[PDB]
Design a protein around this ligand. Structure first.
Ligand code: ASN
Ligand code: ASN
Ligand code: ASN
Ligand code: ASN
Lengths: 354, 356, 355, 354
């Protein structure tokens, strides 16, 4: 047997209709008990399990999967989630780390990529799978993506040692800090533009073991609650004025992800560059990420944004860059130089170095 | 014969290396004269054409294509381009509208989607093709995408009546106000996520005539130089503070595209909503576009951002929404209500209104 | 309420492991009764339905869907299916046509595209949906695609009037005579390379009503049991000898789909062309389909295969071409010329004519 | 400088219109001389090169590329090409092997995948790139894919040591024995369904060095002219009769690729299985390939085709399987068992073992 903790934070997967809109819905364990694909009643009685503990039916062989449902309160639409919600989830995982062999987190899709990226950084030396999942359509609606997304997440966590924060949706397992949301309606909502999926499910399960990170059994789990909250993301647009950039970069901001054009470029107008220089003088750290879905930030143009206190984000998603910025700025007693060096490293599999 | 004006504004397609970086490069016509795929010298002499006028070799059939090169000064990396540059381009087109059957604009990739979207709005009642193109690699580097992009743009503009601002790249013709840049390195740099390409080139040329907009021969070209400059784009991120939104939405801003999560949703924390309400009270107009590449802003969640002075952008790209905002806010003597109604219409083929 | 007949012919969707291999598995209705997504017990009792009749939970809106399971015997791995099996299925549909509003057919994936194409031709003037579906993984294996494929097929048939033989898999509804199997392991096993899907399922259901064929309420269903069995498919390969083609095209063969290279081309070596000419003289009809997954057979090269008794298959799949060949050669009392004219028409939505 | 041999065998890339159809067109070198992208006249005079030798303009960096054009006569539409044409090409390569650093072969698209696969087997221990290319549209038509396909092939061969037979089209370099033709009209005519491209061209050139085969500098080039001609491909279709299979598998056939359904399955009707058994008794060797574009032949069904003298083709393209069959059956003095063992190995990167 392998035992999982299923953390239900909210999201459409569990929502219910109220006043003509979808809102978070409690009572997950109650529903899942009634579904044979999610709970094997015979086995529960035959083994006299507790009532909190659900049991998946068996595959041919491999261990049997048991799981406990922890329903957070209040449950959230993921558009309301922030760094503090992700820290709380990491702390749940830390508190129960020794009792379970893996974790599944049900989450709204709206900020799932940010949550996966944040958790990836918060869970240092992670040894066990932490699989986020969600749905475009609630599990209570007959035709939905929720059933198979949740089951897949549980079976991945229950059966494979993938020591990473991942996202499981639509038969694919992505590295959490590589994903971004690309479709607001289709079941294929997420893409990992600069990395293959870690796994695919079909007639068989194919895992990219060449990509999956190695378990560091020697090192203990270190959960970083020290994540810098004063970080932001700023998307450049043509003609963005220096005065607006000045206002945006005022204290107490400590870091910003600049989402630039193409291969990492912005306007070369001197008043704008002067505001970036001024911010650097104040100690602000800036990461240059491309607005483009695919590819990498590279130098080469006179408009390339590089310079004092600007670190290239290379091929990172903006979600990963913001999480990494929060993580690195939250580390105690480092110099600015050192913080910039850490930003330029691949710390969790989020960035490919050239 | 069909005659085209080729407007060279800058971009990597024409850049040269200086001090280890790419910068705009002058002298386009001089290079193109020397290239048989771009200039048929025999025909030029045989017909004694001017020296400014280049001539493409014959294509399979159809009219022969002649073109004149107008090289802007100064030439720009497109990351430095703004509404005033796009207005200037629209004015060049207006000035020479009667003399040519179509236009090709060489432009940097970095802001090409914005430029295409802006021009789409500025050129009201457009009757002739305006094809933007560019390249990931300069035409002076041997291994490049520039040659075939420029040629294709000229052949599309020269041979088909597609009365739209389009982007041509990597054998595809997109509707200009539907494109966005998706890849910073590959030759397939652009995507039209919520609309098919208007055309594809292979062994044959396939055109989606069911999509292409109809020529309104009755109506004259009206070029809008009255585009509102004080518009912005603001991308929401988890936990974005109300104080930062407040600072961003201060006067003199007149309109903003809010790029929200998923199907059009944002934090429901009251301090943030209050800043949006306050901005609306000051007369700011807001458009709600999704951060997601594909799909549409739709109501349905309690976190759906809707309310006073917020118009849904449905399936619009953010580049289109920003252009449409600039256009609509620049129109004289309209009420805030009327401006909002216009933002909710499909004015140039940039937005699909939902199905019943 | 709308009532469906669910015809279970076999396929991996229902298979069970025996002696270390998958083989067809009986007892479908028994399993489906125990699954709340497939059977609403409350509603069954509340309405006192029969035991053969299952009832789906309510969908968002629209009519409630009831269905009856017909389990064929013997059940087949679809690799063993032939024209006669497909004729039998068409006859089941014919026998029960008036009693149900639609049909779902559970079928193996291995020959599903051929089955869908054949049924498309056999069911002339079809007025109601006939939705084929299947699975890469059996429904009794916990982690599978079978649950959602079967449910979707039933909901599509139960809720929409799409008077076509279709294939439903992995959230997509394809025109049956436009599909081909492209992946032997992934859940996205099928593609419709030269036509959009007729429908897609996500948060919403999107249907291409401008593609869907119109119901011809005036005309009765005519089921063609007269399908020519002596048709074949021959894939050209570089250097294929004239002698082998000769042997392949011997009587009693009546028709062949030639799968040619690229835009419809073959070797121009005279000995091979002469065997094709000889076959034509004997009365064989040939259809030229491209080996390429996407695109169309078009003239333009000196190696283009065209000539006596060779009809261009344009953008047809090979499964559609073979079915259409069987159909057209089975029609009574037509000349060879007339049969060629019919092959050159779009008879069921399987072929796009140039324009 | 690096020197290439450009072998022009025919194909649409060079065709001309005659009597309303495209036919092979001579005079390639004459055309290429007049194109600045293909020939740097200044450099030619400055260096006083021969008139047969063309010179590419300088690329960004790396060695300068010179090439000689060998125009075969007669030129062929690739639909007319056979094992003997491919052997002749291999022999051209062998004859000139020491004089050049790489080879490009202009070829028709219709049978390019078969040609690439055949050459891959014929050129044992290949140390240098052999890049096939072609076009959907002739180079003499103004709007074409030919210019950039040919240039790219020359630059890839001229600048990288990829010791494989490859196909270059539409900015991608595929492993030759992994490709198949998927589109009869679009410029993206080819796909490598079970392997990534070896390289992609965009703003930069990205090479999958993890996939590219290693140069075996110890071993000499061995060109196999001993390729078995009596091999065939047979595509199964539903209800295919035993009598037709019997006729197809008659002597003198020595090997056949059976293209089966799905994961490698066929009818289990006894009369058909008996004909396969009979062919095996006669010494015929059979390879089981899937009709499906993507995936692999795997056991698992009762209808799985396996047995005496049947080797699984796993994930091979049919073009590769046929070439490998021709190669292995052409090897002198091997037992049937040894031949089957060789068919079950990955000999050139064409097959992924489980
Ligand atoms: N599909 C979803 O989960 C969307 C929802 N608004 C959320 O992010 O919580
Ligand atoms: N490839 C390009 O055109 C990028 C360049 N920085 C520009 O937009 O001008
Ligand atoms: N997935 C499947 O259904 C394959 C099976 N051999 C069949 O076609 O019956
Ligand atoms: N595009 C091409 O090259 C097709 C031509 N029939 C050939 O294979 O030679």
């Amino acid at each position: 047997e392998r035992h999982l903790l299923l953390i239900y934070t909210g999201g459409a997967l569990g929502m219910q209709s109220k006043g003509g809109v979808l809102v978070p819905g409690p009572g997950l364990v109650t529903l899942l008990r009634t579904l044979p694909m999610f709970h094997d009643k015979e086995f529960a009685q035959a083994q006299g399990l507790p009532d909190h503990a659900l049991a998946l039916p068996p595959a041919s062989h491999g261990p049997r999967v048991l799981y406990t449902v922890l329903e957070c309160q209040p449950l959230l639409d993921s558009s309301d989630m922030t760094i503090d919600d992700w820290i709380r989830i990491a702390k749940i995982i830390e508190r129960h780390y020794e009792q379970y062999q893996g974790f599944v987190v049900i989450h709204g899709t709206d900020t799932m990529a940010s949550g996966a990226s944040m958790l990836s950084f918060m869970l240092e030396n992670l040894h066990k799978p932490v699989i986020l999942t969600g749905a475009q359509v609630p599990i209570r609606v007959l035709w939905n993506d929720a059933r198979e997304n949740l089951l897949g997440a549980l079976l991945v966590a229950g059966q494979y040692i993938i020591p990473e924060v991942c996202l499981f949706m639509n038969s694919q397992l992505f590295r959490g800090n590589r994903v971004t949301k690309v479709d607001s309606q289709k079941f294929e909502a997420f893409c990992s533009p600069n990395l293959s999926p870690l796994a695919t499910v079909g007639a068989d399960v194919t895992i990219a073991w060449d990509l999956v990170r190695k378990v560091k059994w020697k090192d203990p789990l270190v959960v970083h609650s020290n994540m810098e909250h004063d970080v932001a993301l700023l998307r450049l647009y043509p003609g963005i004025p220096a005065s607006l950039v000045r206002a945006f970069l005022q204290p107490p901001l400590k870091g910003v992800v600049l989402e630039t054009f193409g291969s990492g470029n912005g306007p070369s107008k001197p008043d704008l560059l002067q505001e970036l220089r001024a911010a650097a003088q104040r100690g602000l750290i800036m990461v240059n990420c491309s607005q483009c879905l695919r590819g990498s930030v590279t130098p080469g143009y006179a408009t390339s944004l590089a310079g004092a206190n600007i670190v290239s984000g290379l091929d990172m998603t903006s979600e990963a860059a913001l999480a990494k910025l929060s993580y690195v700025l939250g580390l105690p007693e480092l110099s600015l130089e050192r913080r910039q060096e850490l930003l330029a490293k691949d710390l969790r599999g989020e960035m490919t170095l050239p």
